Amino acid sequence: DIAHNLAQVRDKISAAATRCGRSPEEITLLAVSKTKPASAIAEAIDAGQRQFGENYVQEGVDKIRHFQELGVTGLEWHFIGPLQSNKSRLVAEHFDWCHTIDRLRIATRLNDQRPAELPPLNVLIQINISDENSKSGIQLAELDELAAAVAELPRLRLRGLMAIPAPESEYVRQFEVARQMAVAFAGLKTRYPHIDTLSLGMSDDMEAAIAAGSTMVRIGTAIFGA
Ligand SMILES: Cc1ncc(COP(=O)(O)O)c(C=O)c1O
Ligand SMILES: *Cc1c(COP(=O)(O)O)cnc(C)c1O
């Protein structure tokens, strides 16, 4: 039951924030609806969920168009999958956020294809903080340079960072890795304007990510099942 699952996830988030001395309002729940049908999303919407993450362009755009045509206003759609050049126009025209900026050319493409009447596309730069096997994300040493270039793009808005850490079961390593992201995030925040989003944490490392300084967790299975 999606409505019950949303309540359960929101409870765990709230507890984790409170335990480490943070206001639960600091933590945004991104409901990851990848591979789930639009009816499942509609249940979540009926239960008050407004922010949804999708990983595949056509699937996500089809959902966006569905809920726009039902005249459901007030939603926020985040693209959190890897972005290919030949599918960036659909992201630029329909999504509100994109978490996976890891090369300048894809951000310039998104900026160029974003209609001017839309709000700027909110973007995070994705860090590969700890995953040997992944080809997504930049190294931290590239961040200052990429952030400067992306920051000039007028149809985008740089809001912070995202990372998918390598899968990790030891709480200690979950926290230490998430802290590396939080340190980078804080350093970015002191020099850049409107840095407010650290997209970090899924169901299995939610507590360490929140304790370390995440502002946004990405939950799929624990909301929608599998
Ligand atoms: C269900 C579904 N919809 C849409 C797409 C669109 O693909 P892409 O993520 O490359 O944009 C994919 C395939 O990757 C998909 O699996
Ligand atoms: C799919 C995915 C999630 C959610 O995964 P679950 O294990 O089902 O909770 C979160 N973030 C990203 C980037 C994902 O691709």
Author numbering: 3 to 228
List sentences quoted exactly from the publication behind this structure.
The pyridoxal 5′‐phosphate (PLP) homeostasis protein (PLPHP) is a ubiquitous member of the COG0325 family with apparently no catalytic activity. Although the actual cellular role of this protein is unknown, it has been observed that mutations of the PLPHP encoding gene affect the activity of PLP‐dependent enzymes, B6 vitamers and amino acid levels. YggS binds PLP very tightly and is able to slowly transfer it to a model PLP‐dependent enzyme, serine hydroxymethyltransferase.
PLP binding to YggS elicits a conformational/flexibility change in the protein structure that is detectable in solution but not in crystals.
